Amino acid sequence: TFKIMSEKLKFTGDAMDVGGLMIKNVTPGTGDKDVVTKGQMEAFMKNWMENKL
Amino acid sequence: TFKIMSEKLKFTGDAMDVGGLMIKNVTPGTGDKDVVTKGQMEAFMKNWMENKLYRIGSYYITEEDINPGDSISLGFGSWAKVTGVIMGTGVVNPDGSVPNAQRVEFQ
Amino acid sequence: YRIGSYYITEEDINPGDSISLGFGSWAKVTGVIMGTGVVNPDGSVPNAQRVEFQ
Numbered sequence: 001t002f003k004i005m006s007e008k009l010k011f012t013g014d015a016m017d018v019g020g021l022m023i024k025n026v027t028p029g030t031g032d033k034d035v036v037t038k039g040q041m042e043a044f045m046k047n048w049m050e051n052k053l
Numbered sequence: 054t055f056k057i058m059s060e061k062l063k064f065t066g067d068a069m070d071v072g073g074l075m076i077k078n079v080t081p082g083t084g085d086k087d088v089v090t091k092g093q094m095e096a097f098m099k100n101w102m103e104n105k106l107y108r109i110g111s112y113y114i115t116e117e118d119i120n121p122g123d124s125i126s127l128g129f130g131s132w133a134k135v136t137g138v139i140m141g142t143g144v145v146n147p148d149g150s151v152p153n154a155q156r157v158e159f160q
Numbered sequence: 161y162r163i164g165s166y167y168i169t170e171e172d173i174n175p176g177d178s179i180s181l182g183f184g185s186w187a188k189v190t191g192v193i194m195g196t197g198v199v200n201p202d203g204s205v206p207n208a209q210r211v212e213f214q
Contacts, residue, residue, distance in 0.1 A: 001058075001064045004067065015068055017067050017068050018067070019066060019067050019068070021068055021070065022066065023066065023069060023070065024070065024073075025071065025073065026073055027073035027074065027075065028085065028086050028088075028089065029073060029074045029075060029077060029083050029084065029085060030070075030073070030074055030083050039092065042089075042092075042093075043096065046120075046121075046122070047093065047096065047097075047122040048096055048101050048122075050110055050112065050121065050122075051110075051111065051112060052109075052110050052111025052112060053109070053110060099166070099168075099174060099175065099176070100176050103164040103165055103166050104165050104166060105164075105165030106163065106164055106165060107163060133187055134163055134187070135186060135187060136183070136184060136185045136186060138185060138186075
């Protein structure tokens with residue numbers, strides 16, 4: 001962990017990682033691929049295209 | 054911090070966070086519940102729930118109900134909406150009386 | 161077919177800003193019937209197809 005960040009040497013705006021942070025567990029904050037699934041549930045099941053639409 | 058940093062032990066993909074990050078105010082990246090509100094307003098205020106729009110549903114619940122989206126004021130609509138047009142503009146109908154249509158006029 | 165009371169183009173910044181917006185005349189009729197057929201219910205010959213002018 002320490003050695004890899006040494007070659008970075010540019011972390012000034014906090015993390016600024018070159019990856020995509022492909023891991024997270026829960027919360028409406030950092031968004032995983034479930035945001036798209038969450039969006040279509042809100043759009044179809046309960047907000048826009050409700051039952052009998 | 055070192056103990057919890059060693060506790061996760063799964064540092065392989067650079068950062069490898071475990072937390073949920075519940076301290077934010079406004080940023081182009083991580084967003085609080087405000088991002089949910091932004092999506093709904095775009096889809097409701099100007100996207101789907103347009104002013105004077107007609108919505109058809111099998112449930113007898115208003116759009117402001119807890120079960121429905123629960124946003125904006127919902128009003129019942131009577132009759133259908135037809136685009137403005139003049140009957141017999143091209144004289145296509147033979148032996149037909151010329152009909153006159155008034156814009157924004159209901160009759 | 162999309163119906164809205166706002167005089168804003170579908171591609172405009174105020175509208176959804178996607179797809180091409182075209183004026184639509186009359187109301188959309190479900191494909192299966194065309195309306196007036198027979199005084200006593202017998203049914204006339206309906207029309208079908210999309211974009212077809214008949």
